[PDB]
Every structure is written in structure tokens, then in C-alpha cells.
Design a protein around this ligand. Sequence first.
Ligand SMILES: *[C@@H]1O[C@H](CO)[C@@H](O[C@@H]2O[C@H](CO)[C@@H](O[C@@H]3O[C@H](CO[C@H]4O[C@H](CO)[C@@H](O)[C@H](O[C@H]5O[C@H](CO)[C@@H](O)[C@H](O)[C@@H]5O[C@H]5O[C@H](CO)[C@@H](O)[C@H](O)[C@@H]5O)[C@@H]4O)[C@@H](O)[C@H](O[C@H]4O[C@H](CO)[C@@H](O)[C@H](O)[C@@H]4O[C@H]4O[C@H](CO)[C@@H](O)[C@H](O)[C@@H]4O)[C@@H]3O)[C@H](O)[C@H]2NC(C)=O)[C@H](O)[C@H]1NC(C)=O
Ligand SMILES: CNC(=O)CN1CCN(C(=O)[C@H]2CC[C@@H](NC(=O)c3ccc(Cl)c(C(F)(F)F)c3)C2)[C@@H](Cc2ccccc2)C1=O
Ligand SMILES: [Ca+2]
Ligand code: NA
Ligand code: NA
Ligand SMILES: [Zn+2]
Length: 806
Amino acid sequence: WTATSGSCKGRCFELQEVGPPDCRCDNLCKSYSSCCHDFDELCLKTARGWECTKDRCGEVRNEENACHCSEDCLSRGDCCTNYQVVCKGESHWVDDDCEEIKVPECPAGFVRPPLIIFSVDGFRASYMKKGSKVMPNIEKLRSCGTHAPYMRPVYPTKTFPNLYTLATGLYPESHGIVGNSMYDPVFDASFHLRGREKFNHRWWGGQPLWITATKQGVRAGTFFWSVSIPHERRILTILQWLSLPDNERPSVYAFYSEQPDFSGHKYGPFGPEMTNPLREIDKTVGQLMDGLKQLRLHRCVNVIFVGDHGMEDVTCDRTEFLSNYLTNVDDITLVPGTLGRIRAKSINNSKYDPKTIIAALTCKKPDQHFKPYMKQHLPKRLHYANNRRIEDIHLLVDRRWHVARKPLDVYKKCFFQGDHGFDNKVNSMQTVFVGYGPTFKYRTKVPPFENIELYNVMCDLLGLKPAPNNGTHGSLNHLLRTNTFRPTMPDEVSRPNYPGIMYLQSEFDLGCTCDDKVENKLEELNKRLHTKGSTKERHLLYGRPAVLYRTSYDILYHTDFESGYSEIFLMPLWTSYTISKQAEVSSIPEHLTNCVRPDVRVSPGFSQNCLAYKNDKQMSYGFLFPPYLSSSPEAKYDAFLVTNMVPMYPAFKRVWAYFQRVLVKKYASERNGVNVISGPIFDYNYDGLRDTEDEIKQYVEGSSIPVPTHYYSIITSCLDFTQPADKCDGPLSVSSFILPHRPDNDESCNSSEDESKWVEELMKMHTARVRDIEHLTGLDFYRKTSRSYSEILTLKTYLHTYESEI
Ligand SMILES: *[C@@H]1O[C@H](CO)[C@@H](O[C@@H]2O[C@H](CO)[C@@H](O[C@@H]3O[C@H](CO[C@H]4O[C@H](CO)[C@@H](O)[C@H](O[C@H]5O[C@H](CO)[C@@H](O)[C@H](O)[C@@H]5O[C@H]5O[C@H](CO)[C@@H](O)[C@H](O)[C@@H]5O)[C@@H]4O)[C@@H](O)[C@H](O[C@H]4O[C@H](CO)[C@@H](O)[C@H](O)[C@@H]4O[C@H]4O[C@H](CO)[C@@H](O)[C@H](O)[C@@H]4O)[C@@H]3O)[C@H](O)[C@H]2NC(C)=O)[C@H](O)[C@H]1NC(C)=O
Ligand SMILES: CNC(=O)CN1CCN(C(=O)[C@H]2CC[C@@H](NC(=O)c3ccc(Cl)c(C(F)(F)F)c3)C2)[C@@H](Cc2ccccc2)C1=O
Ligand SMILES: [Ca+2]
Ligand code: NA
Ligand code: NA
Ligand SMILES: [Zn+2]
């Protein structure tokens, strides 16, 4: 119930919300059907439109008008945004040369530069160049402030998950808004774009910027506008709020535009109909900037222009139907479109089986335009599994396509020509970031970055301490002139042991054999030196990784590689080695095919054994430092140490062996040497975080040898590839992956073919940030470089995407 009999007199766009049944006058009252009877009359005036004209200049104030051109309007804070241009001979902001803003130029009473976030739905990154001719205001923000060529959204590339990620710094799996549509099985409740359930606070996790601000005494404008409030009125409302007395005025404000998304769905991302929406959004930007200039705020306010996601060409004829795959299509519920999510239609149906559904959906048609995954097997870079609202079965849909349950869903629900939601590395899904104002840099281009990083920067802009989030605070310091956040490196928690030779060969009973009994004071001293770390500077280029949790581990040195060997997990946590451009690949000699050698530095009790692998019929083994890349026949024996062995399914060994034998040398050739750090990951509960020992669900049969869920590699070289990786003077270049350790290659439809036709494609899909690997391992990399810590934080958040030019 709402008693709409109350009045909005002097309450229009009030900031504090009034609880039911008292009628509301705030920017969301329409969405709740709760506005006071006179809200339209008082608060949504439209008379005479939005622009002053010559004849209105000096007019007698008429309170009915949408905006004012009277002499008193500046002191009232309600002039039309073009008032000083039409009536006082001033220029439009867009017509002014840009001039560096070295310091905030704020009116007295301003305690801090306000922040205004101007968000645009569906604004694809390439609009900034392709539409620049029709967007002069936006082009000026971009060219004069700080801009990235694009900003990476989160998956799924849908509006609600992305706006809420912008507001919180959190992945959707952590903030809870995992799609525009959701079912929560604990609540037994459904969230949809239409309807009231979506306003219930139980859906919305983390702490969004407006709550962060309010809790730390920084006032916020309300971030949400009912769709029927025209943009011109939204702008005038923000400008009115900025004229409030000091103690009442907000410091942070948001404007949201439904365009260009609305038209992009109708017309496609580059439909001729798209020029006009771009022009209209530019005009709104120009109204805001003109209004700020009128208020003498245009060299005080920080403005962020940011999108949620882009827009791809998608039409009804490009739809895959589950009814062409599944015999049992009426037994499932599908959340459809540019991603699929599948669960049982009825929890009472005990004939429901996810394994048979996955199998019926796997590589069934030559051109199949979606791929099914159990959510734990999705690429870890998506961070899309740790939430009860994400169904176990997920369909990753190819760009330009939809998935639907049956044909009748698509015609008895072509209309549309555009859509979004696909994998967040897809070029068409990329969106925009520009920052302009005294706290941002002048005429500065920054590399692409992820939208999860922005909350921390918005907190920095406002002097707020951010709530815990998934950004890496300091990785965007290079966007800012001042207010940088200068983090310190985390402290190492566990210090390594450095074991010498402590066991005789006969103390081992591991069931391993090696043909290594083949027998010099020149070389003997030399090999001792290698085992004490004499080659360590070549192979451990950025210092040893720090272990940020409590554990017992040993540093093991060798001619060609160094490792940190866990006595708890019985294998290395990391293995580090450098491969120069000149390195040669060799074979594993015939007599060494099955060679595994006890490591006389490590007790039998803290070693793997070969018998466990003999008896586990499903499990084989591989090595972290590859025997193919040994520096010499003699050094090759080190690669067969039991301390360099890790459990690998035969199907995975196909992938791993190709990576080690062919790809590492390819990368060293292309990048002028590479440094590689490789190791296992254990994430059985798919939370993105290192498992403890009691979370491990699978062991090599009969043993305490845990089986990794993934294997990672971090591949580093010199950004200036004229310098070799091991003699690099400046910034670094990195690519990394987290490959799923799976007992089949069902993910790869072409895996019956030679590895040269499918393995690199798999690796590219599972590209990762170094930071993703840090979360999954409890390790901290790049501890000892010549580089500033913020630069290293930016390097750790890099994702190599393998898409071509935007
Ligand atoms: C991205 O960044 C985020 C933020 O930093 C990282 O997420 C944090 O990770 C932590 C570990 O997973 C987690 O810490 C736990 O907090 C528990 C209390 O949680 C509540 O309070 C906080 C603070 O206000 C709140 O934010 C939480 O919000 C979650 O839950 C509500 C729903 O209730 C959602 O609305 C919201 O969206 C959010 O959900 C997300 O996280 C939860 C996990 O908390 C998931 O279940 C969801 O799917 C979703 O992803 C909560 O309201 C605390 O109880 C935990 O403590 C357990 O473990 C510790 C060890 O330290 C131990 O002391 C205790 O014994 C305890 O164990 C007991 O409970 C077990 C499970 O019930 C049980 O098995 C045991 O036997 C014990 O009884 C724990 O410390 C923290 O909550 C989140 N924060 C957020 C916002 O998500 C995230 O990891 C980053 N991602 C990456 C990849 O880096
Ligand atoms: C009819 N309405 C439309 O068709 C378009 N539309 C825009 C407004 N709206 C929202 O803003 C949602 C999206 C996620 C969160 N918003 C940000 O999290 C958010 C909003 C603005 C900005 Cl500017 C930012 C950010 F971070 F970028 F600054 C975040 C609330 C819902 C409606 C809604 C408001 C409040 C709670 C629930 C739903 C929406 O349906
Ligand atoms: Ca885990
Ligand atoms: Na085996
Ligand atoms: Na296959
Ligand atoms: Zn859309």
C-alpha cells in the first residue's frame, strides 16, 4: 500500500528514501508505483523544453518551466544547461581548447573534487573510434583526459552483472548477480528484469560504492533512475544537487543511459540507425559539461565515462536448439540466449542425470555453435562457478549465436539484430573507459584493463577505504595524477628449507627404476655447485615466489631449473626455468623412457612412489621441468627426479607434452627467450582459491599423492624483445594459462587430430592472469625485479587474449 495523498512540494528528487506507506518523490518512486500524486506536475516539468533561446534571456521566472533562463537561475541552480551560452555570450565546453587541469579549481565550500560516473549500456569499445565524428563531447573527454582503447567486462557480459561489478569490484560469483535472470534454490525465489523480487536486498552482496561512501561519511546521489525520467531531467537533477549547501551536497553521482544498447539490440552494433543514438548520448554529455562549466565545476569534478559491455550481431536464424540434441528436452529448464544454464525442471525427477545431458551436448554436430561445461570446468579466468545461483551445467555460446530449448521459444515467446552476454574476452563485448578531471592524467592512454579494478579507483577518487574486493589495488595507479594507493608487498609466511644430501639410495623403496648407473674432479665440483644454486640467477629471474600461507617446503636447485617442493603435497608448488632463443630441443633417450630417480635431498617419506602410478590404472605422470629442454645429456638426469614428477592423466599428457616439446621453444624463439614457472593447482571446491589439504577429493590410488585440478604456467620475457629474457633492462611481457587437468579431451572436438591442430587452441581458451594463479596457489610472484611495485601489479593483472585488433 502507498498513501499517494502526500505531496512532493519541495521534495523533488529527495535523497533520503521514505518508507511505505508515505508516498515517495525520489528518482525510483515510479518503479515502485509509489510517487506522490503531484510528482509529475512538480518534479517532471517539461514546459518550453530543455534549451534557453534568445527571447527567454532575462525572462521573468515562471516556476512551470522545465528549466530557466531568468537572471536568478544561476543563484537558484536551475538554469537550462545552455543558459550562459545563449544569454551571456559564453562558449560550449566542447568548443574550448583543452587545457591541463593540474590542480582542482573548486568553488569555496567544496571539500573534495566530486565524482560523476556517466555509464552507458551497450557502448561497444569500437564506438569510440568508429563514431568519433558524431561524438565531439565524448571525443574531447577521451583525447584530453585518460582513456583505455577498451575495458574488459565481466562474464556474463550482461547489464546487471556488469553494472554491479563496476559498483562493487567483485566478480558476479561473489556479488551474487550472476545474470539478468536467476533462480536461488535456498531462497526458492526467482530474480528477473521485470518485477519486484529484484529490489529485495537479499540478492545483492558485497558493498557497492554508494554504501561504501555513506558508511565513511561521504554523501551520494541516488544511482538509479526510473526509465521514464528523461535524460535531460536526470542531468538537471544532478546539477541541482551540486548546488545544495555544503553539508547537504553529495560528493558522488551517477547517470545511466539505456542507449546505445536499446537501439543496438534492434539494429545491430553498426546499423545505420545507430548514428542517432550516439549523437544523442554525446548531446547529453555536452549538457552535463556545459552545466558544470556554468557552475564553475568543469575543472573541479572528476568524470568517468564507462560502459557495461558491447554488442554483437545476433539474429533469430543463428539459434541452436537443445531439442535437436536431447531426447528428454521437457525434463530440463534452460536459461537461454547468449549463454545457457541448465538444471532439472523438477527436483522430484530421479531420472535426471547431468552426465547424460553433457554427453548428448558434446561435439554432436560438425559446426556446433556452443560448448557444454560442468561449471567447475569453465576457464578459470571467467571466475564463474562459486555461487548456488549458477547452475552446474553451462553452455558457452559462440559469438553471433543463441541457444534455445525448442524452436517455439524463438517465435512464440525476426525482431532483433544485436545481443551481448558472450565470453568476456570476445572483441565485440569490450566496452569503454575514459576518466577526465583533476585527479586523472592529462592526454594519457593506458592499456586495456578489467572493470573489476575500477571500484578501488573510485574509492581513491573519493578518499574512501574500499571494502574487500577482486581488484588488485594499485594496479591502476598509472591512471591517476594523485591519490595513488601505494601498497606494500605481502610478507612471506613460510620460509623454505634448503636440504643438502641426506639420504642414501638404498633408503628408498619407491618402486622406481632408472638406467643411470653410467659413470671426474673437473665436473664433480661443477655439479655440486649447480645443486647449491650456482645457476639460480639464470633460472629464477624475478626472485623466488613467496609462500603466503603456513606450510613446509624445500628449495631444490639444479643446472636447468629451480623448484619449491612441498613436503605436504609431495610435489613442487612451482618450478622455474629459463629457455634462451638459442636453446635446443632433444628427445627423451630410449634407455630413459621410464626413468624415475630418488632425490637424495628429500626423505623417502616425503616423496612420491612409482608403484602408486603402476597400480592406478587411470593415472600416469609427467614432469614440471621438461626433459626435452635439458641443457646437456648429463643435466637431463635431473629432470627425471621423483621431486620433479606430477600426476597426469594420459589424455592430459598429450596436451602437456606438446606444450613442453613444441610450444615452449616456439615462445623462446618468438620472444627472445622465456622464463617459465609451472606448477599444480588444487581447486576442488571451485572457489578460485588454493585448497587446503583437507579439501582434496582425489589421490593417486592407494597413496597420499593429491591429484591437481589444473596445471599453470607463467611465461615471462622482456617487453623490448631486442633484449633476451635473462638480460632485460625494462618492463616485462607475460602470458599465462591455467589448464584443466581432465581425464579426457572431450572439450576439444578435434582432439583425434595431431596436437598441432588443437592444443594451442585449448591453451588460448584457458589463458589466465598471474593474479588468478596467485589466488589459486597462495604464491606471490615477481618479488625481486627492478620495476616499481605498481607496474608489477599491472603486469600481474594482464590477460593475453589472443583476439586481433579492436
Ligand atoms: C573476490 O573477493 C571477495 C571479497 O574479498 C572474496 O570473497 C570472500 O572470500 C572469503 C572465503 O571464501 C569469505 O570469507 C568467509 O566469510 C564468512 C562470513 O561471510 C558473510 O559475511 C561477509 C562480510 O559481511 C559477507 O560479505 C558474506 O557475503 C556472502 O554471502 C552472502 C549470502 O549469505 C551473499 O549475499 C554474498 O554475495 C556473499 O556470497 C559469496 O561468498 C560466500 C562465502 O562467504 C559464498 O558462499 C557465495 O557463493 C558467494 O560467492 C557473508 O554474508 C565466514 O563465515 C567464513 O568462515 C569460515 O571459514 C573460516 C576460515 O577462515 C573459519 O574461521 C570458519 O570456521 C568458517 O567455517 C564455517 O562455515 C563453513 C561453511 O559454512 C563450514 O563448513 C564450517 O564447518 C564452519 O562452520 C569465511 O571467512 C568472504 O565472505 C567472501 N566475501 C564476499 C563478499 O564474497 C573472493 O574470495 C574473491 N575471489 C577471488 C577468486 O579471489
Ligand atoms: C527499468 N530499468 C531499466 O531497464 C534499466 N535499469 C537501470 C537501473 N537499474 C540498476 O541500476 C540495477 C543494475 C545493477 C544495479 N546498478 C548498479 O550497480 C549501478 C548503477 C549505476 C551505476 Cl553508474 C553503477 C556504476 F558502478 F557504474 F557506477 C552501478 C541496480 C535497474 C533497476 C533496479 C534498480 C535498483 C535495484 C534493482 C533494479 C534497471 O533495470
Ligand atoms: Ca579452493
Ligand atoms: Na598408471
Ligand atoms: Na575430443
Ligand atoms: Zn542489452
